[PDB]
C-alpha cells in the first residue's frame, strides 16, 4: 500500500488511459533518495496488471546482458540471444506480435539509470525513440536521482516528459512510520515513540529507511521500563541517555615499536616544509633520505639499517597508511605521502611519550 501518494498515482493512471490507447514514448521520473520511486511504480504496475519488464541498470553492466535479460523476461511474460542494438530492434519487433501483446502497451521500467550515460553514446538516444523505430505501442520509463539537465546528449534527442516526486514532511513521515505498528502494544504508544524519535533526529536524518532502522533497533530499550513496572515522564527520564548515546553515531552503525617512529617521521616529513627541517633537528645553527635522516635524529638509540626496517616500510605501504607517488620501477628515488589523521598521530605519540606539537612548524 501507499500512503501520502495520491497525486502522482492519479496522474499516472490518467496518463495510461486504456490498454489499447497509446502514451508518451519516454517519461523521466526524478526525485530524492527516500521518495519511494521503486515502491510506488512497482505497486502501481502490479495493481493495474500490465505487461511490464523491470530492469536494473547496475545488474546489466554490459549491453548484451541488458538486451538478453529484456528479451528473456519479455518472452517469459508472453532461449534468445542477441548482440547488436539493430538485432535487438528486429527481435523485439518479431516477439511483440503475440496476441497478448497485440493491442497493449509494453512498459520497460529501468531503475538506477545514472550509469546509462556511461555505457554507450547512442544507446540512450535509441531507447528514447524506441516507439518510433518499433512502432508497436511501446513505452519506456526512467528512474534516477540526477536531474534531466545532465542526461542531455550533445546532439539533442526526443525530450521525455519530466516528472518529480514530492519530498516528505513531518506528518507524512509520522504516518508512514506509525502505519506498521507492532500488534503487541497500543497504536498511541508507537505514535508517541515516532513523535519523540522525530523530535530528536529530524534535524539531520530525514531518510525514511534509516529512521525506520533506528526505530527498529531502539524499540526494545523503549519498551523495557513498562515491563519492569502510560507514564510519559518516567519513560522519557529512563530513556533519554540511551537516545543521546545513539545519536552520538547517526550514520556510522597496536603497531610494532619502530613502526610508530616511522609513522611519526613520515607525518613530520609530509606536513613540515623542508626549509625548517634543520631548524627542528640540526643541533647547531618527500624523498626517502629525508625520512631516514629524520628517523635517525628522533630516535635516541642507534638503529642499524637492517632489512627489517625496509620490510616495515613496505608493509606500511601495503596497509594503505603511506601512499607511493613515483613509478613502481623507480625504487631508488621513491616518493611517499602520509594519510593519517592528526588525532591518530597525537594518540600514537602519547603512547610513545613524544610531543609532536613542539615540532609541527604550522602550529608554531
Amino acid at each position: 500500500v501507499v500512503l501520502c501518494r495520491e497525486s502522482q498515482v492519479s496522474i499516472l493512471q490518467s496518463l495510461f488511459g486504456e490498454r489499447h490507447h497509446f502514451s508518451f514514448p519516454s517519461i523521466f521520473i526524478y526525485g530524492h533518495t527516500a521518495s519511494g520511486k521503486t515502491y510506488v511504480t512497482q505497486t502501481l504496475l502490479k495493481t493495474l496488471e500490465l505487461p511490464h519488464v523491470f530492469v536494473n541498470c547496475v545488474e546489466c553492466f554490459t549491453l548484451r546482458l541488458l538486451l538478453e535479460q529484456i528479451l528473456n523476461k519479455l518472452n517469459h511474460l508472453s532461449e534468445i540471444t542477441c548482440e547488436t542494438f539493430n538485432d535487438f530492434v528486429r527481435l523485439f519487433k518479431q516477439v511483440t506480435t503475440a496476441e497478448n501483446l497485440k493491442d497493449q502497451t509494453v512498459y520497460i521500467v529501468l531503475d538506477k539509470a545514472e550509469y546509462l550515460r556511461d555505457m554507450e553514446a547512442n544507446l540512450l538516444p535509441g531507447f528514447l525513440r524506441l516507439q518510433e523505430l518499433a512502432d508497436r505501442n511501446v513505452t519506456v520509463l526512467f528512474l534516477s536521482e540526477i536531474v534531466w539537465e545532465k542526461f542531455r546528449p550533445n546532439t539533442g534527442c526526443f525530450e521525455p516528459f519530466v516528472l518529480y516526486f514530492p519530498d516528505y514532511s513531518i506528518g507524512n513521515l509520522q504516518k508512514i512510520l506509525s502505519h506498521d505498528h507492532p500488534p503487541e502494544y497500543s497504536a498511541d504508544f508507537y505514535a508517541a515513540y515516532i513523535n519523540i524519535l522525530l523530535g530528536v533526529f529530524y534535524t539531520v536524518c530525514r531518510d525514511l529507511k534509516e529512521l525506520r532502522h533506528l526505530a527498529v533497533l531502539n524499540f526494545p530499550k523503549y519498551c523495557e521500563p513498562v515491563v519492569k513496572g502510560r507514564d510519559t515522564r518516567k519513560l522519557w527520564r529512563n530513556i533519554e541517555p540511551h537516545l543521546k548515546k545513539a545519536m552520538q553515531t547517526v550514520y556510522l552503525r597496536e603497531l610494532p615499536y619502530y613502526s610508530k617512529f616511522i609513522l611519526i617521521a613520515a607525518y613530520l616529513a609530509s606536513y613540515n616544509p623542508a626549509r625548517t627541517d634543520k631548524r627542528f633537528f640540526l643541533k647547531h645553527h618527500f624523498p626517502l633520505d629525508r625520512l631516514l635522516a629524520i628517523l635517525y635524529s628522533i630516535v635516541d638509540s642507534r638503529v642499524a639499517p637492517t632489512a627489517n626496517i625496509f620490510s616495515q616500510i613496505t608493509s606500511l605501504v601495503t596497509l594503505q597508511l603511506l601512499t607511493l607517488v613515483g613509478h613502481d620501477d623507480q625504487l631508488d628515488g621513491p616518493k611517499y605521502k602520509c594519510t593519517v589523521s592528526l588525532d591518530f598521530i597525537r594518540a600514537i605519540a602519547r603512547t610513545v611519550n613524544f610531543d609532536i606539537i613542539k615540532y609541527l612548524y604550522d602550529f608554531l
Partner: protein, 131 residues
C-alpha cells in the same frame, strides 16, 4: 565542369518555372545559409546572441563561461522588459543553438562552466542582427 553542369541544369529548371536564372542557381547552390538561419531565429535566441556579443566586446576574448553570458542575458532582458528567465530555459536554448552548429559547447556534464565559441564570423552576426 561538374558544378558548371549542375548550374546549367538548375538554370534550365528555373527557366521551366535569362541570366537571372543562372544567378539564382549560382547564389543558391554556393552561398551560405547562416545569415538567413540567424534572421529566422527566435526572439530569445536573438537576445542570447546580443548578450554574447556584448560580453565579448566587454572582455575581448573569444571564449566565455556560461555564467557571465547568463548575467548579460538577464541584464538585456531587464532592459527589454522581458519576463525573468530561468536557468533551465537558457540552457535549453543554448543546447538547441549548439545542436545546429551555430555555437561550440560540451553541455553533457558541465552546466554553469561551459566555454562558448562563435562558429561564424562576428561581422556576419552584426550584419544579420542590424536588420
Amino acid at each position: 565542369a561538374r558544378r558548371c553542369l549542375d548550374i546549367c541544369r538548375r538554370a534550365t529548371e528555373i527557366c521551366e518555372f535569362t541570366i537571372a536564372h543562372s544567378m539564382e542557381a549560382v547564389d543558391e547552390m554556393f552561398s551560405s545559409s547562416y545569415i538567413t538561419a540567424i534572421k529566422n531565429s527566435s526572439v530569445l535566441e536573438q537576445s542570447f546572441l546580443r548578450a554574447i556579443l556584448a560580453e565579448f566586446r566587454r572582455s575581448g576574448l573569444e571564449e566565455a563561461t556560461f555564467q557571465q553570458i547568463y548575467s548579460q542575458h538577464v541584464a538585456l532582458c531587464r532592459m527589454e522588459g522581458l519576463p525573468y528567465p530561468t536557468m533551465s530555459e537558457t540552457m535549453a536554448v543554448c543546447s538547441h543553438l549548439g545542436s545546429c552548429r551555430l555555437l561550440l559547447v560540451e553541455p553533457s556534464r558541465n552546466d554553469l562552466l561551459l566555454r562558448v565559441r562563435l562558429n561564424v564570423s562576428q561581422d556576419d552576426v552584426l550584419y544579420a542582427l542590424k536588420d
